[PDB]
Structure formats: structure tokens, C-alpha cells
Design a protein around this nucleic acid. Structure first.
Ligand SMILES: [K+]
Ligand SMILES: [K+]
Ligand SMILES: [K+]
Ligand SMILES: [K+]
Ligand SMILES: [K+]
Ligand SMILES: [K+]
Ligand SMILES: [K+]
Ligand SMILES: [Mg+2]
Ligand SMILES: [Mg+2]
Ligand SMILES: [Mg+2]
Ligand SMILES: [Mg+2]
Ligand SMILES: [Mg+2]
Ligand SMILES: [Mg+2]
Ligand SMILES: [Mg+2]
Ligand SMILES: [Mg+2]
Ligand SMILES: [Mg+2]
Ligand SMILES: [Mg+2]
Ligand SMILES: [Mg+2]
Ligand SMILES: [Mg+2]
Ligand SMILES: [Mg+2]
Ligand SMILES: [Mg+2]
Ligand SMILES: [Mg+2]
Ligand SMILES: [Mg+2]
Ligand SMILES: [Mg+2]
Ligand SMILES: [Mg+2]
Ligand SMILES: [Mg+2]
Ligand SMILES: [Mg+2]
Ligand SMILES: [Mg+2]
Ligand SMILES: [Mg+2]
Ligand SMILES: [Mg+2]
Ligand SMILES: [Mg+2]
Ligand SMILES: [Mg+2]
Ligand SMILES: [Mg+2]
Ligand SMILES: [Mg+2]
Ligand SMILES: [Mg+2]
Ligand SMILES: [Mg+2]
Ligand SMILES: [Mg+2]
Ligand SMILES: [Mg+2]
Ligand SMILES: [Mg+2]
Ligand SMILES: [Mg+2]
Ligand SMILES: [Mg+2]
Ligand SMILES: [Mg+2]
Ligand SMILES: [Mg+2]
Ligand SMILES: [Mg+2]
Ligand SMILES: [Mg+2]
Ligand SMILES: [Mg+2]
Ligand SMILES: [Mg+2]
Ligand SMILES: [Mg+2]
Ligand SMILES: [Mg+2]
Ligand SMILES: [Mg+2]
Ligand SMILES: [Mg+2]
Ligand SMILES: [Mg+2]
Ligand SMILES: [Mg+2]
Ligand SMILES: [Mg+2]
Ligand SMILES: [Mg+2]
Ligand SMILES: [Mg+2]
Ligand SMILES: [Mg+2]
Ligand SMILES: [Mg+2]
Ligand SMILES: [Mg+2]
Ligand SMILES: [Mg+2]
Ligand SMILES: [Mg+2]
Ligand SMILES: [Mg+2]
Ligand SMILES: [Mg+2]
Ligand SMILES: [Mg+2]
Ligand SMILES: [Mg+2]
Ligand SMILES: [Mg+2]
Ligand SMILES: [Mg+2]
Ligand SMILES: [Mg+2]
Ligand SMILES: [Mg+2]
Ligand SMILES: [Mg+2]
Ligand SMILES: [Mg+2]
Ligand SMILES: [Mg+2]
Ligand SMILES: [Mg+2]
Lengths: 134, 147, 206
RNA sequence: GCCCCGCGGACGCUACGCCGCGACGAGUAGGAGGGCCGCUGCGGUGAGCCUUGAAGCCUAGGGCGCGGGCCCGGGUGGAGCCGCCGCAGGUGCAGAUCUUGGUGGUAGUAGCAAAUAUUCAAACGAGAACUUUGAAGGCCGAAGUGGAGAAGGGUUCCAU
RNA sequence: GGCGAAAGACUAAUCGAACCAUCUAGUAGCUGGUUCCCUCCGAAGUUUCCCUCAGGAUAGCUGGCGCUCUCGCAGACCCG
RNA sequence: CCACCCGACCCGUCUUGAAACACGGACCAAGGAGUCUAACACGUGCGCGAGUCGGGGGCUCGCACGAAAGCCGCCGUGGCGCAAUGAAGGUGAAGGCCGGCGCGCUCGCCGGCCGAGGUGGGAUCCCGAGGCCUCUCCAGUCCGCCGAGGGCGCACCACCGGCCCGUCUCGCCCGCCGCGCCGGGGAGGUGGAGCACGAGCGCACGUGUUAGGACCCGAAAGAUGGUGAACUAUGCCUGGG
RNA sequence: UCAGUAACGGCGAGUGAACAGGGAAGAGCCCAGCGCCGAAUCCCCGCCCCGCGGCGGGGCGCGGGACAUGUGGCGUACGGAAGACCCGCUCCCCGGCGCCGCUCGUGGGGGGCCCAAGUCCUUCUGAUCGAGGCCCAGCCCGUGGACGGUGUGAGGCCGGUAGCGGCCCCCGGCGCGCCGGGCCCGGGUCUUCCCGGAGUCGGGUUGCUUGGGAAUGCAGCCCAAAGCGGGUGGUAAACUCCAUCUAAGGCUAAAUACCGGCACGAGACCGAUAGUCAACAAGUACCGUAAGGGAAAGUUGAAAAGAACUUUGAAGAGAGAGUUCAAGAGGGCGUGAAACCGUUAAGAGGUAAACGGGUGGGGUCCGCGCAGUCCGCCCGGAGGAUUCAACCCGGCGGCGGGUCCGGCCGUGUCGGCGCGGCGGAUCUUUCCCGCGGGGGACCGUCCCCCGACCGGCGACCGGCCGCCGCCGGGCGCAUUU
């Protein structure tokens, strides 16, 4: 149960904050689980999805083992486009189909200075909580 | 509880218990106590004799604290002390009587309703009724005045 | 319109009362707010008593309440003078001072004078400079005994003197309480007209 | 001796339940009782129902109840819903020249009749009584159906 | 209030007192309406008083809730 | 769905009287009218009971629920109830027998006992001669029902008496720090929303009554403050005909 | 709370305070005057030194001005001042030290970034967050099973949630630490001196106001003070006593109010004719000269995959095809009612239609009826067997035995236990001290314990015995079951 008096449980409020969140908040909302090997390697459960990240679709009609690259993170629509996750329009044009980032698993991360800083923050905190649970 | 009211049973009866002829109009007869000396005279004379007129002397700035004088009768006078005090006195070898201070109990005047148990008692009060003092004397007690 | 037997009622609802209706939905919130302020004040003023400065015993006025005592606003200047406390010093050490009150009787004055002295013994006075103490309570006394006294300081209680049973004398049995009240009322009622008549005959005879 | 060839002998009695007998039954205004009548939400409860199809809606389907109403089948629908014990109310419509929204008969009806008047040919065009061009016959008739302004309009001006 | 060679005319389709908002959900003994079912009981238009006569108060007529009592037996069966 | 026989006028409403040549209603959907607050009365349910009630405050390291709940008791202050009556000063609810006397009022002082009088009715309860009977007789025991008759009489009713307060008539006696224009007492009437071994308080529900928008819709009006002379009325200025 | 009270009122309708009491909070003070101090006071300007976004501190200036028509220190009704004598002393405050003490109360405040655990197996589906499973109480986390999102319905997919959880940054009060500094006597007794607000109070009269009633408050006009005075003392007035305060100058936190505003939480509320007028480009469109008035209006789908291409038409619009679980979702597109209409099928039709009762005919559909009682016992034939009674061995249960045994319980008497606890309008010169609280005795009650003794064991309860019943096993091996 939630105990913070300054945090709301209101359905209308939480929906309003979610659907009107600014982009930088939408980045956190668009987090995706790491793969087991990545989770074991970095001791991190989830990362905000980024373009040029290899993912697997694990739910929906496009679920499978294929590793695809994230080609576009459309935050305004809360959806991501993956390189082979497409479909055929009537006139023959091929369009990507949006997949919610919570329904994909990151298999390879696009590591740069910022991601490495983010990863070592989450793992330091996860480990510090173990120094709590113990 | 609205589900238990007559309103629920009156749904579909047209005049809602108020009549087809006389109806339920706004204020037939006036508002409040209108017509007490006129069209409503009989009611006022029958259930409220004395309603109209002036009687007596009026007193400005009445302070009810001044006339404060609670009373205790004789029959309930022994309740002011513990039952131990009453019995110990009745079986007391010498004629020692307990002292009952009705002012301590929150009473100022001792009235004389009822009868007392036959044992001496020293009653302290601001005021005593005549019969109250007589009955205290009859059982062998004494009346002591305090201020 | 009256109907059969009823009480004549005059409800005071002829103004725009609906515009001035005070609801009490913030009563739980008000109680919480007062509690937190009390706790905040107590922490700030520790170890001084939470309720506040000591108050004197006063007798409630009027015949309805003169049998009871209660806490007064502050100790009178005469009470402080007898107790040997400067009126300016009294406030700093936690003694309420009421310059308006005057002591009509010596019983009330001695009751509060004794209350002040007994308070002064119970008081633990910390030095203004912790390193240097001059006339303050002992370091040992301050170190352990000092704690915040919750509740009114030396609550004022109505004391009742027990009166043991005794043998009724002949005089008490012969005392006419009713007649004493009846004559005393008449003596007070007729005192003046008796002074007038008794005086009036004086120059009549002289 | 009580029991015994036999070891046994229906139902009942939610006591707020069950059973028997007798007499009774009109009703406006109005009163009262009962409602396992109905609506919405709350506390409990149904190890309740539900994407293997909830609510809603439709039904020459099958039934129950004096009735208020209810249950089920089929169809449609696509995500929620209901029973029971209590609680609560903005709780039940045929009317109010009621409110708002929608829709008929009237009815393809009344009407498209104030100020004389149009016709021929061609063009463009899918399409011409009505557009354009030419020809004819007419009207305004300088107090104009002409040519320009003020106020007001505000782009209506011009081209495509 | 204006203005009126005067008609109570005119004062923005409004005039024997404009228009707008508020007071204001103004008051109405007067008109209209007043939403499910079954069951049981079931009227009054009369008395008196009222600036009362299209209204009330009053008694009557109504319902509801009771309560205080009376009246039982020859009998599991039948049988005074 | 249709046929036939019998019955069968359109509802709502006001009304003595509606199918009316009384009014409203073309049709359908959705909305649509006794509410809530305070007060009061009675009735019913619950708790406690001569009491009852924290509603305001405070305490519990406030806070999902919890703005709840629990607790206070030298927090019951206070409300209502336990005492009435009078305009008020004020006064303020217990008597009956047994004696010992006095006095002759029909009363008064003392000791006792008892303890809210008496009469008629009175649910219930108690006693109960007499009865009923077993295979029979002799007397017994357990042991129910019927029971004339009698007794104690709840609540309640009616009546008599009594008690408190107001008021009146009457008449004597007593008290003492106040000898007084002092105080108290009796008896017979009469006024009181009194007494006569309490019944209330808190909470809830219902019905009725009222003040409130007060079941819903409805005036003609009244008031306060503002906006208008682009119409029109009239004066003036400056132009045109 | 007093209290719908005292009081007001065509004493009608109606109206209506205060004091005492209990609480929340609590905090006190400053002038003028009267005096004394050599104006001891203030503002401005210029310069320098130091803290130093102008906040200032000091120093200087034969700089200016205010001000004796009165600034400042002291002092104000609780009295004050001076002098003498006695007693006790070296304080207080503001700004920069540093280190950082610090629930400051739910962990000072503000901002940022992070922190548990299934997308396991099988299956359902368009998609799933559904269903089943995940040994041994174990799928896993849980101080986290609030909420929201994600193609259903998710504690474990994601954000979050919990946590005196972490990290970073900023801001503030306190706590001790040199200073830049300022500032610095008090109390008691005695003697003497000093001591107060005026066109104000008060009075008349008028009007309003109030519960204030022969005038509660306010104001106008007229009159107009006093100093042992003045005000008040709820009935006008005179006399007298008493009580009580000290007007006509000023400041002051808290408890209190808050339909505007800035943030935030919640709800037995409403759910698009409801709820704000406004869920939407709403005070918008539109109306009025203007003041002002003022709407209607939400929903494809999981995803636009928003229907390529062929074909008729001038096109609107169709017919094929295609997407989708679905277009029987096609762009005001969820569902799609009624009124009303079109078409199809059936029936009927000259007393407008419609209606009640009764039957008949037809139709629709249902029973799906269309060979249609089963159950119990007994008899006969024809089979099969884990075979019946009885008896033995275990286990369990029911009932009985309190003159079977523990345990216990109900109540009572006596002695006695823990100085036992609690209460008491009982007593206390046993006793203690500062004139009352203690501590004792007694009484009542409860609780414990301790011997005798006590009625009874659905109050709870075991062992034992007796009986009966059931179950499992054994024997029983066939006129039995
Ligand atoms: K009625
Ligand atoms: K123009
Ligand atoms: K009518
Ligand atoms: K009609
Ligand atoms: K009402
Ligand atoms: K005046
Ligand atoms: K049709
Ligand atoms: Mg909401
Ligand atoms: Mg009726
Ligand atoms: Mg009617
Ligand atoms: Mg009527
Ligand atoms: Mg306080
Ligand atoms: Mg009937
Ligand atoms: Mg059926
Ligand atoms: Mg509601
Ligand atoms: Mg309604
Ligand atoms: Mg309708
Ligand atoms: Mg109707
Ligand atoms: Mg025509
Ligand atoms: Mg025509
Ligand atoms: Mg012409
Ligand atoms: Mg011409
Ligand atoms: Mg001409
Ligand atoms: Mg004219
Ligand atoms: Mg005329
Ligand atoms: Mg106008
Ligand atoms: Mg109305
Ligand atoms: Mg009338
Ligand atoms: Mg009259
Ligand atoms: Mg008439
Ligand atoms: Mg009429
Ligand atoms: Mg007529
Ligand atoms: Mg009719
Ligand atoms: Mg006719
Ligand atoms: Mg009419
Ligand atoms: Mg009509
Ligand atoms: Mg409706
Ligand atoms: Mg009651
Ligand atoms: Mg209580
Ligand atoms: Mg809450
Ligand atoms: Mg509470
Ligand atoms: Mg009380
Ligand atoms: Mg009291
Ligand atoms: Mg009797
Ligand atoms: Mg006399
Ligand atoms: Mg009398
Ligand atoms: Mg009534
Ligand atoms: Mg109106
Ligand atoms: Mg008028
Ligand atoms: Mg003009
Ligand atoms: Mg009262
Ligand atoms: Mg007056
Ligand atoms: Mg008033
Ligand atoms: Mg007070
Ligand atoms: Mg001066
Ligand atoms: Mg997580
Ligand atoms: Mg979800
Ligand atoms: Mg979830
Ligand atoms: Mg799970
Ligand atoms: Mg947290
Ligand atoms: Mg005086
Ligand atoms: Mg006087
Ligand atoms: Mg000041
Ligand atoms: Mg809708
Ligand atoms: Mg709306
Ligand atoms: Mg609207
Ligand atoms: Mg579908
Ligand atoms: Mg398709
Ligand atoms: Mg469809
Ligand atoms: Mg659809
Ligand atoms: Mg649709
Ligand atoms: Mg028929
Ligand atoms: Mg039991």
C-alpha cells in the first residue's frame, strides 16, 4: 500500500500525468527490460529505450527471437519502431508498426558516456539496497 | 433512511396524500404564529391559556448566579456520604454523630421531604426549611448554618 | 398553522441564515493543527514546562462558584513582594504576574505566597553560561532531574477538610436554624427604617 | 420377564416455521402493512459470473408470479456484471399550453403571380429556357434601370 | 427623469413610467402537475370562532398504535 | 395474425355532476415534483438508570483505510432529569396507631412502635371444605385435576382523606444576641402546569407540525446600481434643397 | 455553555445579549505631562578605514540643516525620582569566525538522479494482464499485493509503491567556536520631592442604533466642567455610605476567519439533457448601440493496417478486390432503442381504428412426442466375485462409572498467605517533618495462596474400566453375502 500523503492514487490524476508527461519524463516511462545476460552483466533490470538498441519483441503478433534494431522512439505516441517489425500498406508502401517498449527486451545496448553513467548508477543503488536487505 | 418514508409509497397516487379538493398550497392560514388572536384564536386559547398579555414585574440584567440555591431533600440526604459513614455511626458505642456538609456535595438548602433514619446527624447547610430542621431535631441531630 | 396540541415555537430562521452557516468539517484538522503546534512549542521551550508558567489559586466569584478554586491569571504584586520575587524577574523564571489583582483577604495571599515559595524550591535554574554558574541550580540537579513537566504546573485542586464525627452538644440541639435565618432576613430588611425611627425619636425626646 | 425369529419403523419443526377450524372480501379523499417489486452507490458475503463472451439492445422462442416484475433460449454486442445480509439516496412518469432532443399526418400540399418581353443562331461544355458572342424585338428615358460620391460595409474589388 | 403646437404622445419594433443586471428560487387563501405493485381499514361538505364567505382554527367523521380486561376445555383417542 | 358472438364512448383534471359543445394531451426518447437543516410532539427500537450525556477540549512518536477508532473522570464545566409555587420579597412537599398527661380544642406536649393513608373494583398469586380414581375391603404414603369459599392484592380507574406554595376568613399560643411596624405555629375555605418510595437521560427510526426556496412551475408588482436621444421628441451649431 | 434566557416588541408577528463556569491561546508595554541632565538628540553632505549585491560600523570635517514654539537619556498610574545607609555583582546584544551538534519532528526545506521480484512450462486469444502448473508449508519479492500504463483482467513487463533507503546540488534556523564590534550596574530600607491627555467629560435636545427597557452606543446642534476630582455600580431624582476603575494619546504575537490566488490530497458525489455556462479552438461561436446575454458540441481501430488495383459514371456515387477478430468498426466512424419510413413475407379489410371475455381457423416455434412409467421388496431361471454371519487383532467414536482415579469447578465455614491490589465523606497527640501532607490501623472489595471441608462434572477434561457402534486387517470359501 502507498503511504506517502503527497503521492496520489487518483486514477484520473495518474492517467493525466501519464498522457501529458513531457518528453524527458516519457523517456523514463519508455523503459524496457534488459536480457538475462545483460541483466547479469550490468546488474540492472531496466533501461530507458534508445534508438540503435537491439531488441526482441516478446508480446504480440510480432513476438519472436529475431534481434532487431530500434529505428525510431516516437515518445509523443509512447511507441517504438523496430527495423523488421513492419507491415504492408494497401498501395505497397512498407510502414513500421509501433511496439510499446515494455513489450520488448533489450539484447544489446547502445553504450556511450551517458548510458555507462546511468548503468553504474542503477547497479550501485541495487547493490546498496542489498546492504539494506541483509 | 428515505427508503422507509411515505414518499416511496405515495409514488403514483397523484395528490401525494394532500387531497384533490383542498390540495397542498403554500401557506393557507398564515406563516408562523399568525392569527393567534383572530382565525387561530381557538387553538391558542385551548392549548396555550396565558399566551397573550403581561404579568408581573420585569427585572433588567438578571444574573441567575445570584439566585443559585440547589436543594436536597431529607430522604436523599444520607446519600451525600459514604455508606460506611452511616453504618459506623449507627453501631457507634458513644453518641457520636457524622457531619454532613451539603455545601460540599453541591447543595445550599436542605428541604424536608421524606423521613430520616433514626440516628443523630450534624447537617451543615446555607439554608434549612422549617420541616427539614424539625425532622433533623426529631431524630436527635443538629442543624448548623454556614456561609 | 397550529394543529391540535403543540408547543408555540419561534425558530430564528427569518434572516439569510443559509449564507452564514459554519460547518465543522475542519474540526479534526484543527485538532491536529493545535496538537502539532503544542508539540512544536514544547520542543522549542524544553525543558521549561509545556503548559506554561505557574498560575495562582483564585476563588471563583458569585454565590454559585465561591466554594471552588481555580487557576488565576497571574500572581499579584503583593504575593510576589511577600515571597521576595522581583515582578520583572518572575516572568523569566516562569511565574505569571497579574498587576491588576488585589488581595482582599490574607488567606488568599498566604495560599499563593506559599505556592510561590514551594514553586521556587522545585525550580531548576540553568546558568546563562553553561561553563560559569552563579546562583543557578547544581550541575548534578540540572544534569538528571531536569525534564519537561507536562500538564498544568502544580495543578490547583479543591481541598476538602474531613470533619470527624462528634457528640452533639446541648447548645447545638437547641440552636434554631430556621428562626435564625428568618429573623436575620428581617433584621437586614428593617435595619434602616429602625435606624430612622430610633434616630427620629432622639431629637423628639431631646 | 420389556423388549426381540426380525435390531427396525415415512414426513416433519427456515418456531419470523409448519398445521387445523370458522367467518369474511365495494371504495374516492386519506391512513397503515407487506413486497424473494424495481433503480444507483457503500460495508460484508457468494473460493459468485465473465473474451469458451459482461453490460446494453432486439425477439411470431420457453416459462413463472394476482401484480409490481423476473428467469431462461436465440440474435446482436465487445468488458465488465450480479445474488444474498445490512447501509445510503438527487430511486420508479402519461399528462404539468412540462424541459431538451428527435419525428410524423398535413404534403409533393400552400406556394415559387407587384413594377410590359422575349426570340433566332453559334460557341464552350458530360450537361444550356437561364453562361458567353452575334442578330432581332423591347424597356429605363437625363427627377434614369446612366455616370460619380458621403455615411455604413470591410476585401465584397481584380484575375484564375 | 427627459421631451411634448398635448395624442399620455415620443424616449432604439419596448412607454399610464425604457432597457440591463442584481435583490430573487420575491409572495400567491389562486390555476396546473405531483412518478411501482398487492393487501386491510375507510370519510367529509356539518358545529363554533375568525375583515371569515374560493381560506383557516375548532369539534365531528378516519386511520394507525396499543393497552386493560372478559370468555377456554373433563382427555393421545372418543368421550357433556 | 385473422374470423365470429356478447360486452365495450378518452384519458388526466377540477367538479354535486365529464364521453362531453369544460381544459391539457400530434408522436417518441431522455430529464421531471414532500427534500434537507433546526426546533417541537408522540409512538417504536437500543443502552444505562436517579441519574444520563462528552456533542467542546485534551491524550494515544497524527495521516492507506484513519477526517476513523480508542481513552479521559479532580475533563461532567454544562444540559436535561431528580421540586414546586408566587408578580415578588420568599416559602418549599409523612403520616397512623400504643400509651402518660394536660386542654377542650376537637386539640397540644412527651416515650414507643411502625413507616406514603383509606374505600370499591382489580390480571396474577396464596389457602381450600368438598370431589375424581385404580380387582375388592382395612387404614396410610407419593400424588395431578375439579373446586364452593376465603385471603394478600400489581398496574390502572374512580372516590375520600393528607402534604407543599399562592390567597382569603378566623382565632389563640409560643421563640429570643436582636422585645421588634420581629420571627414561628393552628383551623376552615379556595388558586397551582406540585407531593403522596422517583423515570429520566442519550442515541436511532417513523409520523405529524413549523421557520426556512420548503413538493414543482407561475404573477401584476417593489428596491438597488447601471446602459441608452443610431428611432423618435424638443433646443442649439454648421451645411444642403 | 449561559440561552431562545434577562430584555425588546401594533408586549402582535417576531426579536434577543451579557456576567459567572469549562476550554483554545496566552505577553506585555510605550509616550505626552511632571522633573533632572551644558541639545547630552536627529537628518543630509563630503572623505578615509573595515566587514561590504547600500546593509552598514567607526573616525574626521572652525561641513550644512532640524531643533529651546523642545530632540534625546531617565520615567508613566503596577507608582516614579533624588539623597543617605545596607546587601549582591560584572552583564546583555548584533554582525562576519569555523566545525558543523541538531525527527527542526515522522525524520529542517527545495531540486535532480537511482534502488525487489516470472514475461518460466502448457494452453486460450486478434492481442493477452485469462486458465492450469511450478517437490518438500517454497515459482519468486514483499518494510514494496496503492495507482497508472502496456493489444483482456499484471505484486513480479514499465513507471512507480515501501524503506529513521542511497547519492548529488542548493537554501535556512539553531549548537559551540575569535572577533567587527557595540553596551553595561542591580536590589532593599529610610527621609524628602513629584504625579497625568478639555469644545473633552458631563447636561439638554434631535436623528439613527441597540435586548438595554424614564434613553445601550453613535453623531449633529446648544450648553459646557471638575480635581478628596472624574467615570461606572442595567428605574428617573435628592441625600448618604460603600465598592470599583482612572476616560478624552499610542503599540503589541497566539488561539480566530478565508466560495479570491498559488500548490496539493481526498470522496458512500455527477457521469456528457448529469457534473461548473464550459470534459471539446468556452465566456468560444452568435445576439444586442450598449450595459449585458450566451450556446451546441466526447467515443473508428489493438495498430491507419484510413480500402492498392480493375471497372461504370462528368462527378457525387457504385460493383469487384483488399486491411482487420470485426467495416454487420469506412473518417461526427463503440453500442445503435423508440417515434417515423422503405422493402419483404403472412393475414385481413363497406359501419374510423383500437379494446374486454369466449371459442375457432391459420402460422411460428417448442416438447422433438413420434411407442413412452420408473423405484422398492419377493418369486423363478441364468451367470460372476475383493463373499456373509460369527469369532479374533488393532484403531476410533458414543454412552455410563465423581461413593473409577487425576484435573477441575460451584459455593460455604475456619485459620492463614502474598506490607497482595484497589477503593473508602472510617480512625490515627504510634510516629515524621513543613500551621498539612505522609506513614499506619480499620472497613469494603478483588486477586493469589493455603489445610480441613464442600455439591457437581454437556464448565472444560485426560487416564482407566464396562457396554455398544463403526472402520481396517485376519479367519470364515459357500443352502451364506
Ligand atoms: K396526508
Ligand atoms: K461611401
Ligand atoms: K382541471
Ligand atoms: K380536451
Ligand atoms: K417543508
Ligand atoms: K448628544
Ligand atoms: K417493417
Ligand atoms: Mg475525479
Ligand atoms: Mg388512494
Ligand atoms: Mg391536485
Ligand atoms: Mg386544505
Ligand atoms: Mg494551553
Ligand atoms: Mg377492499
Ligand atoms: Mg422453463
Ligand atoms: Mg446519488
Ligand atoms: Mg427525482
Ligand atoms: Mg414522457
Ligand atoms: Mg398522472
Ligand atoms: Mg401546386
Ligand atoms: Mg403561383
Ligand atoms: Mg414607362
Ligand atoms: Mg421609353
Ligand atoms: Mg419626367
Ligand atoms: Mg410637435
Ligand atoms: Mg385620454
Ligand atoms: Mg434601450
Ligand atoms: Mg418554488
Ligand atoms: Mg381565498
Ligand atoms: Mg376581527
Ligand atoms: Mg360567498
Ligand atoms: Mg377552484
Ligand atoms: Mg359547474
Ligand atoms: Mg373525465
Ligand atoms: Mg354538450
Ligand atoms: Mg382552467
Ligand atoms: Mg390542445
Ligand atoms: Mg424517464
Ligand atoms: Mg423514546
Ligand atoms: Mg458518560
Ligand atoms: Mg482520509
Ligand atoms: Mg475522536
Ligand atoms: Mg449532571
Ligand atoms: Mg455542576
Ligand atoms: Mg386498592
Ligand atoms: Mg406574629
Ligand atoms: Mg392552603
Ligand atoms: Mg403534533
Ligand atoms: Mg417567480
Ligand atoms: Mg408596495
Ligand atoms: Mg439624432
Ligand atoms: Mg435550557
Ligand atoms: Mg427600545
Ligand atoms: Mg434586529
Ligand atoms: Mg465568561
Ligand atoms: Mg521630554
Ligand atoms: Mg521494478
Ligand atoms: Mg492494466
Ligand atoms: Mg498492475
Ligand atoms: Mg502471479
Ligand atoms: Mg519512497
Ligand atoms: Mg468614585
Ligand atoms: Mg448608589
Ligand atoms: Mg510603542
Ligand atoms: Mg450518452
Ligand atoms: Mg453540460
Ligand atoms: Mg450547458
Ligand atoms: Mg464486432
Ligand atoms: Mg472483410
Ligand atoms: Mg454489427
Ligand atoms: Mg463495431
Ligand atoms: Mg455506429
Ligand atoms: Mg378479444
Ligand atoms: Mg459451553
Amino acid at each position: 500500500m502507498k503511504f506517502n500523503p503527497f503521492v496520489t492514487s487518483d486514477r484520473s490524476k495518474n492517467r493525466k500525468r501519464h498522457f501529458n508527461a513531457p518528453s524527458h519524463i516519457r523517456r523514463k516511462i519508455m523503459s524496457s527490460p534488459l536480457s538475462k545476460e545483460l541483466r547479469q552483466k550490468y546488474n540492472v533490470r531496466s533501461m530507458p529505450i534508445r534508438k540503435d538498441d537491439e531488441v526482441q519483441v516478446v508480446r504480440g503478433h510480432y513476438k519472436g527471437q529475431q534481434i532487431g534494431k530500434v529505428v525510431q522512439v516516437y515518445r509523443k505516441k509512447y511507441v517504438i519502431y523496430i527495423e523488421r517489425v513492419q507491415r504492408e500498406k494497401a498501395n505497397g508502401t512498407t510502414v513500421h508498426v509501433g511496439i510499446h517498449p515494455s513489450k520488448v527486451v533489450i539484447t544489446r545496448l547502445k553504450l556511450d558516456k551517458d548510458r555507462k553513467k546511468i548503468l553504474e548508477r542503477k547497479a550501485k543503488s541495487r547493490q546498496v539496497g542489498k546492504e539494506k536487505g541483509k | 433512511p428515505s427508503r422507509l418514508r411515505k414518499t416511496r409509497k405515495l409514488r403514483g397516487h397523484v395528490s401525494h396524500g394532500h387531497g384533490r379538493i383542498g390540495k397542498h398550497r403554500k401557506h393557507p392560514g398564515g406563516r408562523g404564529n399568525a392569527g393567534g388572536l383572530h382565525h387561530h384564536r381557538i387553538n391558542f386559547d385551548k392549548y396555550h391559556p396565558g399566551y397573550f398579555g403581561k404579568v408581573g414585574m420585569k427585572h433588567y440584567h438578571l444574573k441567575r448566579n445570584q439566585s443559585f440555591c440547589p436543594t436536597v431533600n431529607l430522604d436523599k440526604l444520607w446519600t451525600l456520604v459514604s455508606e460506611q459513614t452511616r453504618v459506623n455511626a449507627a453501631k457507634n458505642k458513644t453518641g457520636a454523630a457524622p457531619i454532613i456538609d451539603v455545601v460540599r456535595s453541591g447543595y445550599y438548602k436542605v428541604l424536608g421531604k421524606g423521613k430520616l433514619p433514626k440516628q443523630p446527624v450534624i447537617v451543615k447547610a446555607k439554608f434549612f426549611s422549617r420541616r427539614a430542621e424539625e425532622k433533623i431535631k426529631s431524630v436527635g441531630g443538629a442543624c448548623v448554618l454556614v456561609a | 398553522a397550529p394543529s391540535r396540541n403543540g408547543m408555540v415555537l419561534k425558530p430564528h430562521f427569518h434572516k439569510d441564515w443559509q449564507r452564514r452557516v459554519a460547518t465543522w468539517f475542519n474540526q479534526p484538522a484543527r485538532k491536529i493543527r493545535r496538537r502539532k503546534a503544542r508539540q512544536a512549542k514544547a520542543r522549542r521551550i524544553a525543558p521549561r514546562p509545556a503548559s506554561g508558567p505557574i498560575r495562582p489559586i483564585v476563588r471563583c466569584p458569585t454565590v454559585r462558584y465561591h466554594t471552588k478554586v481555580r487557576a488565576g491569571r497571574g500572581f499579584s504584586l503583593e504575593e510576589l513582594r511577600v515571597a521576595g520575587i522581583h515582578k520583572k524577574v518572575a516572568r523569566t523564571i516562569g511565574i505569571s504576574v497579574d498587576p491588576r489583582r488585589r488581595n482582599k483577604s490574607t488567606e488568599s495571599l498566604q495560599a499563593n505566597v506559599q505556592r510561590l515559595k514551594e514553586y521556587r524550591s522545585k525550580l531548576i535554574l540553568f546558568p546563562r553560561k553553561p561553563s560559569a554558574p552563579k546562583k543557578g541550580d547544581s550541575s548534578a540537579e540540572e544534569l538528571k532531574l531536569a525534564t519537561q513537566l507536562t500538564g498544568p504546573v502544580m495543578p490547583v485542586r479543591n481541598v476538602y477538610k474531613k470533619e470527624k464525627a462528634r457528640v452533639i452538644t446541648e447548645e447545638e440541639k437547641n440552636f434554631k436554624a430556621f428562626a435564625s435565618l428568618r429573623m436575620a432576613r428581617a433584621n437586614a430588611r428593617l435595619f434602616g427604617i429602625r435606624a430612622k425611627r430610633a434616630k427620629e425619636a432622639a431629637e423628639q425626646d431631646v
